[PDB]
Write a protein that binds this ligand. Structure first.
Ligand SMILES: NC(=O)c1ccc[n+]([C@@H]2O[C@H](COP(=O)([O-])OP(=O)(O)OC[C@H]3O[C@@H](n4cnc5c(N)ncnc54)[C@H](OP(=O)(O)O)[C@@H]3O)[C@@H](O)[C@H]2O)c1
Ligand SMILES: COc1ccc2c(c1)c(Cc1no[nH]c1=O)c(C)n2C(=O)c1ccc(Cl)cc1
Length: 318
């Protein structure tokens, strides 16, 4: 149940999403990561941004200690936050994630976003007028620092997140490149299916990893409440009824059959266990075309405050 990455390592094709908004107590991340491993999740997606790597690492430690898994059975992802793009900050940021999680390595380290921010430990640097402070960094130099993290053994694989085709090509065409990104983790669901970007990634042996594949958590700081609810889509709901599954399972299976590695966040014990049932049924070729028809170019995150960023990913066609 894995895909082979272009560096030879293997990534489980279903991943557990661990982000929860700050109102959720941090003990929950510990509890649900254990439930996820107990349910069969082996790929766990975290990040410095999520303020939960300590709890996710504790959950992994606990399941290793009780004999449920070994460390090599777990695929753990962290991400470099955008205030750490300057190359001298990359390894210290990774080492800090490893210390928090009490891991010797991450299986995957990503550049969280191409949209560089003012360097510092402050995650949301803002000016005297409350505006986020951008930074200008050559992401090829960030990538060179990521490559050194892989050679140092601290990350088994390295990749990117929220890149568009042009930004991927900047890395791929970098002189003296040693490691291609193994993946590009991007927003991907039936209302924003990234088919052109997926075709490009396939042509370069880069895995597309889908986040907000269930339509996001609809956080009201970020999500227009008038945006359509993905899991209420009539086509998804009709397919769920036809297959005797759930709209969530349809949305996850859609990604698996188009060669996309799919993440699924749930902090609910029964939904966690439901999502691993994605492997138990199949969509027909006609089902897949019907879902392909749902694309609305819908980004669940209101990105107006970032649209002026030089590395804003959504100005290009893809
Ligand atoms: N690289 C990035 O920039 C980036 C951005 C966004 C997300 N991510 C990663 O992707 C992960 C998931 O994306 P997401 O956080 O946007 O959430 P999601 O996977 O789109 O799921 C969204 C909501 O679906 C609900 N859900 C889960 N399973 C369900 C089921 N079987 N039936 C019905 N509802 C179900 C969950 O609510 P309950 O918890 O109540 O089940 C969750 O809040 C994140 O946790 C994070 O790891 C990365
Ligand atoms: C749909 O929800 C979204 C969408 C985008 C998101 C996020 C959640 C999150 C935060 C988060 N929540 O859960 N896990 C995560 O990492 C970030 C850090 N995003 C980006 O950086 C991003 C890239 C391009 C653009 Cl234009 C805007 C934002």
């Amino acid at each position: 149940q894995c895909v082979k990455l272009n560096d030879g390592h293997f990534m489980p094709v279903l991943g557990f999403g661990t982000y929860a908004p700050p109102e959720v107590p941090r003990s929950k991340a510990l509890e649900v990561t254990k439930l996820a491993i107990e349910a069969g999740f082996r790929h766990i997606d975290s990040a410095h941004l999520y303020n939960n790597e300590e709890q996710v690492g504790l959950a992994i430690r606990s399941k290793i200690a009780d004999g449920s898994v070994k460390r090599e059975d777990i695929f753990y992802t962290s991400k470099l936050w955008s205030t750490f793009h300057r190359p001298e900050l990359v390894r210290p940021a990774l080492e800090n994630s490893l210390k928090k999680a009490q891991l010797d390595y991450v299986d995957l380290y990503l550049i969280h976003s191409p949209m560089s921010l003012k360097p510092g430990e402050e995650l949301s640097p803002t000016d005297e007028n409350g505006k986020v402070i951008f930074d200008i960094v050559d992401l090829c130099t960030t990538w060179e620092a990521m490559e050194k993290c892989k050679d140092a053994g601290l990350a088994k694989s390295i990749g990117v997140s929220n890149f568009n085709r042009r930004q991927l090509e900047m890395i791929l065409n970098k002189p003296g490149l040693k490691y291609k990104p193994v993946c590009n983790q991007v927003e991907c669901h039936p209302y924003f299916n990234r088919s052109k970007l997926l075709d490009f990634c396939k042509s370069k042996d880069i895995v597309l990893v889908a986040y907000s594949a269930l339509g996001s958590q609809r956080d009201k700081r970020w999500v227009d409440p008038n945006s359509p609810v993905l899991l209420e889509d009539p086509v998804l709901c009709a397919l769920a009824k036809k297959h005797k599954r759930t709209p969530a399972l349809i949305a996850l299976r859609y990604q698996l059959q188009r060669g996309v590695v799919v993440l699924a966040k749930s902090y609910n014990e029964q939904r966690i266990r439901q999502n691993v049932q994605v492997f138990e049924f199949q969509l027909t070729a006609e089902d897949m075309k019907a879902i392909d028809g749902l694309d609305r170019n819908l980004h669940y995150f209101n990105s107006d405050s970032f649209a002026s960023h030089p590395n804003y990913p959504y100005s290009d066609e893809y």
